[PDB]
Each structure stands twice: as C-alpha cells, then as structure tokens.
Amino acid sequence: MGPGFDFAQAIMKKNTVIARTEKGEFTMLGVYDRVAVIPTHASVGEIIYINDVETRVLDACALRDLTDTNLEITIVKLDRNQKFRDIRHFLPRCEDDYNDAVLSVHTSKFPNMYIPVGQVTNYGFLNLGGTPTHRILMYNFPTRAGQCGGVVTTTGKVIGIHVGGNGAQGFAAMLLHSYFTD
Numbered sequence: 647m648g649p650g651f652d653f654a655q656a657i658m659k660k661n662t663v664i665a666r667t668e669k670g671e672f673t674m675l676g677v678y679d680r681v682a683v684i685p686t687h688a689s690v691g692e693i694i695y696i697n698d699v700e701t702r703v704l705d706a707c708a709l710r711d712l713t714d715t716n717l718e719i720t721i722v723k724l725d726r727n728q729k730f731r732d733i734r735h736f737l738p739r740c741e742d743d744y745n746d747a748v749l750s751v752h753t754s755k756f757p758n759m760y761i762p763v764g765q766v767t768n769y770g771f772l773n774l775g776g777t778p779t780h781r782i783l784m785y786n787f788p789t790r791a792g793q794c795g796g797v798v799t800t801t802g803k804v805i806g807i808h809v810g811g812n813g814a815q816g817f818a819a820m821l822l823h824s825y826f827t828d
C-alpha cells in the first residue's frame with residue numbers, strides 16, 4: 647500500500663521459504679548463500695522441509711549472547727541447490743528502536759500476509775515461554791500462532807524475526823549484521 651509494504655514485499659518475494667519441522671510450519675528468512683534463520687523453538691534437526699522438499703541441514707546454531715542468555719535465533723545452513731540473494735547490507739549493526747515497521751508472514755495458513763505494527767521498542771529482556779531471552783523488540787499488535795518466523799522490516803532495514811506474543815504485544819528477536827560475518 648506504501649513504501650514500507652514495498653520493502654517488505656521485496657524481501658518476501660526473494661528471501662523467504664516455508665520451513666517445516668516437527669514443531670510446525672514457519673516463515674524462514676534466507677540471508678545469503680544457503681544460510682537462513684528461524685526461531686530456536688522450531689527445534690531444527692538433521693532434516694527440514696523447505697517449500698515441501700526434504701532438505702539436509704548442514705549446520706544449525708542456536709545463538710546465545712556472551713552472558714550465555716538465549717537470543718531465540720537459530721542460524722541454519724541448508725543443503726539446497728540454490729543461493730539466496732545476499733541481504734546482509736540491510737541488517738542493522740546495533741540494537742535500536744524503530745518507527746513504522748511491517749511484520750510479513752508466508753505459510754500455508756497465512757500466505758502473502760503483511761501487518762503494519764507501528765513503533766518498535768528495544769524491549770531487551772523477556773521471559774519468553776519461561777526462557778530468559780535478550781535483544782527482544784516489542785510492537786503493540788495482537789499477533790497470533792502462525793506468525794513465528796515472520797520478518798520485521800522498516801524501509802531499508804530487516805530488523806528481526808517474530809518469536810512470540812502475549813495477546814496484546816508481539817515480540818521479535820533482533821537480527822544484527824555481526825551474526826552473519828564469514
């Protein structure tokens with residue numbers, strides 16, 4: 647509808663796949679080469695389904711901060727025959743607050759879904775499903791089951807992936823450029 651939705655659509659149309667684990671179907675953001683991200687609660691194993699194709703997992707790492715606190719981001723390297731467009735230059739370098747974000751989801755349950763969530767707060771600490779979690783972004787939208795993995799964007803930046811909600815607020819794990827250096 648506007649330039650925020652334009653940036654979101656551009657990311658969804660080239661840098662997302664549908665990931666299926668034994669814990670459900672997730673929006674999965676591809677970042678570069680065969681490297682993608684997914685919420686750690688997806689419990690990625692040795693095999694994952696990518697757009698309904700059986701795919702070997704070459705590496706999976708559940709990220710934690712240097713205090714050994716959960717970040718709720720798993721970085722997955724896929725045995726896929728195709729690379730993602732490199733979008734690392736759209737990742738923030740530092741923790742921040744944002745205006746006017748969009749949450750975008752693409753699954754069997756919610757295809758081509760875009761939600762203007764408004765202002766995004768650097769919330770920090772969250773007890774997420776009983777797990778102490780750091781680097782949480784918060785937005786005041788009543789997000790629902792089916793939205794985990796959804797991509798949070800502003801104009802020009804890919805800032806997070808949706809990891810939970812409390813019925814009134816939604817919560818995303820930050821994406822930082824430093825997670826994807828090689």
Ligand SMILES: C[C@H](NC(=O)C1CC1)c1cccnc1
Pocket residue numbers: 653654656657733736
């Ligand atoms: C304007 C456009 N932006 C995107 O693709 C956003 C979705 C990432 C673009 C065009 C040419 C080179 N870089 C970027």
